[PDB]
């Protein structure tokens, strides 16, 4: 608050605070059959049934 008329403040204070980031681990598992990966990627690029 501004000065004057019987009002005496604890004039403007400034922190400088250093805080830390907190890491987190998230796991997941995808299983895929080897048949569908191979038939969807073939060296002969003719179309499929």
């Amino acid at each position: 608050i501004a000065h004057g008329d019987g009002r005496r403040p604890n004039k403007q204070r400034q922190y400088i605070v250093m805080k830390a980031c907190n890491k987190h681990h998230i796991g997941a598992e995808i299983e895929l059959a080897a048949a569908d990966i191979e038939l969807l990627f073939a060296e002969k690029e003719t179309p499929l049934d």
Binding site: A33, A34, A35, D36, E38, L39
Partner: protein
């Protein structure tokens, strides 16, 4: 002292579709056999009287 010759086997094999055993079997090569688990072909066979 001499080195009179240097020789080595070369292996050739008549593959399965060029032997005479394929006269006793039908050969239908499939793309990825890992896709199907069990073949369970059912037949309806009817006899005469």
């Amino acid at each position: 002292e001499a080195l009179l010759g240097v020789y080595t086997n070369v292996v050739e094999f008549v593959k399965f579709l060029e032997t005479a055993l394929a006269a006793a079997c039908v050969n239908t090569e499939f793309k990825d056999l890992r896709r199907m688990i069990d073949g369970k072909i059912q037949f309806k066979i009817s006899m005469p009287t």
